[PDB]
């Protein structure tokens, strides 16, 4: 019943802050606080809503607001990095590239539902260790997926499952075949956020703009399952890495928070007497010339390609990206 | 090493009612249920009876401590060391001296250490009300007690972390029985039957040669280590007052962040946990008169009198909730 | 199945069979044979129909057929009593308790549909050997259940996941007011089902009988849930101990599959070395002398109190019971 | 006794492509997977390699065979026993020999064991298109291969079964990456790409001083391992035209069970599944054109001319399936 999904009576601040939902740069961390940390909620209505897909596909609202809360209250409060933040800022940014110039009209309205809750589920239920922190401890995790994408299976595992709590079935009046199709799509975009799938995905995409076709209009020509769905795994890795590329003020807090995580990551690795993850160690790291390297290796190559397919609608994001890597150069103590 | 005298001057008292285990929380990095429970088998010699190698132990302490929640203000590694911390107490008392076996003492001291692992803040009922898969997976019968259980066992399977390697198959048949009774009736629905049997048997109580209590089948063996932990688990207002408002603190957010959640949700918000309608005093005052009080009245008879410091200071207690009742 | 709108052959003694639904000694065998190894599926349609509970509940016809078949393809067909011809047979012996003259109007339908239901699943997916066999090997189903009533635990718990395969949630249309406590007294008649709870079951049964109430017709008085679902459990429980109490020709089906089913548990035991259970070893086995022991300390005094409950409606159902009794009793060699 | 020796006897042939495994099944009291897994235990000295208690060995094997399904007419516990003892004599090719170490041989043997264990008689299709369970956990990708590998594992878990519980945790690491290796590649979603690599390691073999193969990276080691139980796994029709025809009605009959679920259900009949328009000579024929033959000949082509006989007997039986075509 909510404007927002969620009660708030700061709801003026937060409806003024929910503006800026189609904007890169949202302040996804104020509309945190003020949503009373329903960051995914109500960032997630407010994109249904923007896109009219509670009645392009029947969801009722209570059932959708419902199934919001489940599956953000399945992030965990005590992880810094991996949240519901984190996956707020993932759907929004997802949000924003599907609306970039080049791929106007490119996806249908399934494509995109997919593209979103896969963004949203994404990292669910993560629990912020590595998926060699679960492996090496023989987790039953690790055991269930035979090591293989272990979180990663395990997020979209748990995605699934909440939809079978009480009145959170979001996709109760889709066809089976719009059911198998979105299924499909999603399970496809969530196993390519494992960064083992990284080179690969990056590979493919170079290819795609080495042999990029556009139509008539000015958009995206995408002819098959298999580019559509490539093209829509490497926008939701891209968001899932656009950290960086946001304003400075985002980005630096990103950094403090994964960075935190890296962090308790290494202290209970250290207590356990297990060999110290890279960049773990808070006795012996380098926060600022492990984002420029992040930048370098990762980060650029990835978002340098990306702008290549949408040219030159990625431009300012990309031109943002290149400031933030001189700052924190800029920042390594000599 | 400047604060590990602090924790090591700390953890003297172990073996004292009224630990200041929220000190120790801190001091040792919020690993109290590790630290504790270590000390507490070196004290014992655990280690050595049942061949734990030190390491297997700890890490498996380190596991199960990962497993409790830290978002989770009351049912988390704190309250499990308290409990176990606790159950070492009572288990030391005169009136027991000798009683139970090390595999009985083992028992009784690992369930409390897993008796809530894996708590996610809510209530059963919640976790029913929303078809949970953890209510589908139990039925909704003790759903997060079943689970808590589970988890723990389970976490024996992860590297170098199963501390019972070296036991027999007849003392980990035992050992597991015991475990899962002591567990399973901590679930408050369990409460009142299980008080009954503790009435009853101090009523026909009976003492050894040596003035110790007499115990010969396992039900009655195993009715007063499942009393004994269920004290344990419910001692918060048997501690000294400063400690107690402590928990109390802990339990009204736990509640009210549920209740926050049902509301969202349109669900019916559960007793006492509506903080726009609460009665904290009101309700540890009935806290303590219908069920705290009753119970540890009769561990009191049990034990007696090695345990009237406790139960004077739940008294005690008691009134000081009292004064502070809203007019 | 048919062909141009009517019956085949097969079809239409099936049907004729299935006239004998409200009747004591149906020929369950014959109606498995008939129904292509679908005696479950077809008897509880038969039931529901008749009973017109898809009307009542508003159950979709083909969610309940896929439902049905989905939960009789999860009894192991190679287990030779806890099969589905089993569950069918209880289901099938409820159905004719719930309509005993003493009991007339007595439940309402939700309580009707629970006790059918919880029939229908009491037994799936049971592997054919006991409780304490799962827990001697340390099965991951008596670690997931704590050793206790493990089996009834898992029974219930696949009944109810199977109504989230596609199609298959009969209960779609049920309020969540109906739906709990359809759940809950399910749940509580299932779990009646282990042997470990039928003392106190009959302990309560038989106190019910002492302090028996009716009205100004010959109808029982239930006054709150604790005496209707002990009523309920009760004659579940009944149901599921029934053989002895049908026709010889029957009941001997069943002694000889139980017999069977027994010594396969032996065998497993014996290469493993475990001590045999009782009975279950088939070369020091005294298949009457069980026989009559079952009756005389299980079977005979649940319904000889039950009987008294619904004095005289249960008569012919004791004189059978008592000379089957004598059948075994006088084949037992000196 | 009598019973006892012809299944010895037969138990001789352990060593040869073609035994006559469901005899054996039959001898044994349906106990093929126990008998034979133990047997080439014993045939490589495994239990003494690795420590493995022999009540543990013994355990283990009955308790993974019984997790096979009776009721399933292809997928149970002979063909189980049947990929194992294949694996087990390609693993003794002479243009293999002295290439594994004995914890590469015991991953494939082990990994051909449980391949299969706890299938359900129905495609990963059918699950997917249900909506069940298992789907759901594993993504529909590759359920019922990542379900092997799961419960195969976890079974080890059970009363006296850890057959590793002597294994150190470098080997033990070691195993399990090998058998997860060599199972996930037994789903048919990965022939063409695991045939591919073959093929290219095929054209860049390099043998070695005794003539034997070249085997540097573990990519390579591992392919060679996959592809050598993928063979295992779809050698039915290589084998004496006797068993192939046991195994075709076998496989026929689990297609036309799951077709006749299909119907019944009112989803689409899987290719092959319908009995009302089935072409069981037709399909084998098309089987061993498109897939079994194709994968054989570049295997013969690795450890050329080992595998001759065993390729000719598939040509043999291809000639006799088609000559059986009606028309
Ligand atoms: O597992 N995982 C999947 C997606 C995203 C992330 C967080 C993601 C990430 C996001 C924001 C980060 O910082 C900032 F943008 F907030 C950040 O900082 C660090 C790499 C140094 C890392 C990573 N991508 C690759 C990561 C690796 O550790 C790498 F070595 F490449 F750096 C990995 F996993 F590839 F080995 S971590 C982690
Ligand atoms: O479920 N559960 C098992 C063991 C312990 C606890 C915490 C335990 C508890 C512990 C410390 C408490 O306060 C203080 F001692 F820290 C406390 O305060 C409240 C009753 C108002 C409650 C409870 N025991 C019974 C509880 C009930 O909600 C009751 F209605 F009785 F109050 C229940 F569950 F019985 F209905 S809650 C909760
Ligand atoms: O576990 N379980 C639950 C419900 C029903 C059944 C089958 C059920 C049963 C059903 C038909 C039987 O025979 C015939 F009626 F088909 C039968 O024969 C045997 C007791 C000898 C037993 C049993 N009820 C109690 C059983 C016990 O093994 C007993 F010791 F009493 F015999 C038990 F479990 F009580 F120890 S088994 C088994
Ligand atoms: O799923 N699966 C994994 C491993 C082995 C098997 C049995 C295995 C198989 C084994 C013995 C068979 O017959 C006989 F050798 F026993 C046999 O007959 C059939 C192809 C028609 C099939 C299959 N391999 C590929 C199969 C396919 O269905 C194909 F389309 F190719 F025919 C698949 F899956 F590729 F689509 S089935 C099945
Ligand atoms: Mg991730
Ligand atoms: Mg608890
Ligand atoms: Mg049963
Ligand atoms: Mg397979
Ligand atoms: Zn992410
Ligand atoms: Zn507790
Ligand atoms: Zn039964
Ligand atoms: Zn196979």
């Not at 896109?51 to 029947?58: A, E, H, P, Y």
Request: glycine residues 2%; aromatic residues 8%; hydrophobic residues 40%.
């Amino acid at each position: 019943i909510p404007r927002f999904g969620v009660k708030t009576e700061q709801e003026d601040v937060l409806a003024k802050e929910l503006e800026d939902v189609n904007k890169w740069g949202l302040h996804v961390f104020r509309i945190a606080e003020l949503s009373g940390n329903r960051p995914l909620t109500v960032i997630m209505h407010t994109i249904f809503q923007e896109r009219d897909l509670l009645k392009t596909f029947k969801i009722p609202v209570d059932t959708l607001i419902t199934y919001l809360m489940t599956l953000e209250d399945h992030y965990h409060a005590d992880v810094a990095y991996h949240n519901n933040i984190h996956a707020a800022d993932v759907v929004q940014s997802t949000h924003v590239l599907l609306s970039t110039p080049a791929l106007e009209a490119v996806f249908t309205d399934l494509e995109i539902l997919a593209a979103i809750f896969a963004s949203a589920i994404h990292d669910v239920d993560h629990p912020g260790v590595s998926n060699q922190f679960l492996i090496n401890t023989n987790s039953e995790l690790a055991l269930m997926y035979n090591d293989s994408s272990v979180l990663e299976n395990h997020h979209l595992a748990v995605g699934f499952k909440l939809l079978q709590e009480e009145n959170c079935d979001i996709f109760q009046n889709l066809t089976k075949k719009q059911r198998q199709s979105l299924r499909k799509m999603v399970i496809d975009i969530v196993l390519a956020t494992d960064m083992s799938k990284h080179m690969n995905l990056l590979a493919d995409l170079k290819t795609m703009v080495e042999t990029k076709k556009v139509t008539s209009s000015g958009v995206l020509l995408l002819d098959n399952y298999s580019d559509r769905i490539q093209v829509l795994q490497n926008m939701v890795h891209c968001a899932d890495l656009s950290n960086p590329t946001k304003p400075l003020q985002l980005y630096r807090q990103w950094t403090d928070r994964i960075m935190e995580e890296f962090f308790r990551q290494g202290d209970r690795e250290r207590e356990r007497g297990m060999e110290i993850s890279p960049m773990c160690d808070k006795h012996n790291a380098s926060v600022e010339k492990s984002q420029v390297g992040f930048i370098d290796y990762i980060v650029h190559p990835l978002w340098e390609t990306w702008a290549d397919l949408v040219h030159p609608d990625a431009q300012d994001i990309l031109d943002t990206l290149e400031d933030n890597r001189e700052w924190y150069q800029s920042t390594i103590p000599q």
